[PDB]
């Protein structure tokens, strides 16, 4: 199926109006309304500037496009309000010529590209269900001094602190196999793709989607504080050009389904978080996405990292790639822009959108526990998933009859993945285990689980190990 997400259907059905006060300057009577005091549309620029909201939401943006479209004279052919930008040359155009690089015409030749700060964002906010999730991720760095990469799992729902907002709600982090170092890390892309395909399938059975990525850039400041260097700030960079390219690739691989787009998709709800030092030398999180222009640049293979982290390098025209003139709308301190040449390299922050982040207050968290059983791919930290560990974690509790404690133990993302990897439980029993871990009313499921053949078999296997 290819339907829209529930949150999108819900926000399309909201109107997002913002009532205003009548003004001293209104020219009508003591009662009534006019265009100067009437409710604001959800995309209202001045409202967002006034409340320090850096981008309008996706659904505010879509409603803005729809209103402009409805100004066409009626009868005119319908046009989808959204379209994913595409900067790729058509290497199969035979319109009175042989295809690139042996010919070119107005139908196949990319015209000049103008980059500017994107006015909307697909996701507005990243909410981590528990601080323990982030803190255990950070522990990989704390223990090793090496950086860490993870994929975030969860869902999307409404965010009320901006007009028609959306938040990504993070329930867990999965760290793929990786070689970590003090100043970076390397993944085998094929290995990771293959592994995450399997995790995606299992996470979906738990009601989870892969909703973003997260990484550390943490360096001890050398003061014994536990304090770290601030590397990312207004006078340096926020995301490097390498990281923007990474985010763009992920966004394009995780398209956002939209019935209002020519292509049936538009951009992505996939979010990018970085954990690094803030101006006070504290460990903190920053959340981003990249623009649709960034998606299109990277799909067209037009940009590369550069030796200056704040800058993207623009690639050359080849037999496989066509790079037109590229400009960007360079902003001054008042936000006023002037068109400038983006070649040979340009500031990548024009390709960024910023998101807010936070935690909920004291709780529909999917997993009761976030820690206590080793996360995946942590053998180098001395945390391996094996029978010895599972027995230590689970065995005595599983035979105590304490379902509160058993529930706390099995309601654990990495625990569930490990147990399913053992292929002891049947699909039916695996489903019971998931229900026991994530349902509000879990006790009935757990009672069925514990009485099942597969579970009794698992418990016996544990008993007879060690």
């Amino acid at each position: 199926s290819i339907k829209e997400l529930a949150v999108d259907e819900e926000l399309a059905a909201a109107d997002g109006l913002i009532p205003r006060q009548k003004s001293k300057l209104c020219k009508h009577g003591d009662r009534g309304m006019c265009e100067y005091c009437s409710p604001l549309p959800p995309w209202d620029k001045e409202y967002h500037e006034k409340n320090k909201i850096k981008h309008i939401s996706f659904h505010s943006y879509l409603k803005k496009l729809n209103e402009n479209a409805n100004k066409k004279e009626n009868g005119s052919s319908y046009i989808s309000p959204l379209s994913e930008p595409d900067f790729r040359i058509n290497k199969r155009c035979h319109n009175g010529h042989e295809p690139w690089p042996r010919g070119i015409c107005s139908k196949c030749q990319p015209s000049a590209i103008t980059l500017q700060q994107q006015e909307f964002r697909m996701v507005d906010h990243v909410e981590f269900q528990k601080s323990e999730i982030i803190n255990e991720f950070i522990q990989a760095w704390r223990y090793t001094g090496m950086q860490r990469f993870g994929y975030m799992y969860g869902s999307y729902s409404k965010y009320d602190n901006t007009p028609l907002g959306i938040k990504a709600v993070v329930e867990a982090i999965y760290e793929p196999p990786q070689h970590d170092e003090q100043d970076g890390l390397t993944m085998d892309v094929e290995q990771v793709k293959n592994e995450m395909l399997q995790i995606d399938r299992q996470a979906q059975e738990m009601g989870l989607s892969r909703i973003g990525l997260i990484f550390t850039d943490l360096s001890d400041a050398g003061a014994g504080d536990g304090s770290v260097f601030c590397k990312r700030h207004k006078d340096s960079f926020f995301l490097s050009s390498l990281e923007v390219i990474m985010a763009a690739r992920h966004q394009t691989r995780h398209p956002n389904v939209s019935k209002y787009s020519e292509q049936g998709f538009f951009s992505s709800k996939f979010v990018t978080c970085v954990i690094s030092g803030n101006l006070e030398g504290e460990i903190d999180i920053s959340s981003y996405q990249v623009s649709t222009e960034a998606e299109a640049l990277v799909t067209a293979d037009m940009i590369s990292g550069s030796t200056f982290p704040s800058m993207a390098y623009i690639n050359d025209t080849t037999d496989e790639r066509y790079v037109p003139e590229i400009f960007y709308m360079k902003s001054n301190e008042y936000g006023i822009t002037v068109k400038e040449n983006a070649k040979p390299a340009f500031p990548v922050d024009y390709l960024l959108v910023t998101l807010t982040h936070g935690f909920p207050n004291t709780t529909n968290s999917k997993f009761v526990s976030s820690t206590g059983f080793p996360w995946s791919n942590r053998q180098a930290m001395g945390q391996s998933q094996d029978y010895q560990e599972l027995k230590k974690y689970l065995f005595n509790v599983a035979s105590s009859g304490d379902f509160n404690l058993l529930h706390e133990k099995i309601s654990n993302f990495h625990l569930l993945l490990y147990i399913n990897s053992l292929q002891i439980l049947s699909p039916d029993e695996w489903k019971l285990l998931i229900e026991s871990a994530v349902k509000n009313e879990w006790e009935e499921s757990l009672l069925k689980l514990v009485s099942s053949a597969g579970w009794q078999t698992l418990v016996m296997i544990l008993q007879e190990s060690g």
């Binding site: 950086q147 990469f149 100043d183 970076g184 890390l185 390397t186 993944m187 085998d188 892309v189 990771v192 990484f215 850039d217 260097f229 590397k231 340096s236 490097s240 390498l242 990281e243 990474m246 690739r249 590369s304 990292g305 550069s306 030796t307 200056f308 982290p309 800058m311 390098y313 690639n315 040979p344 390299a345």
Partner: peptide
């Protein structure tokens, strides 16, 4: 001035830029 191309393969992350 201007930077050089630093075209790292997909899946390689680097943070060791001079502060």
């Amino acid at each position: 001035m201007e930077p050089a191309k630093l075209d790292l393969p997909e899946g390689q992350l680097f943070f060791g830029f001079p502060m």
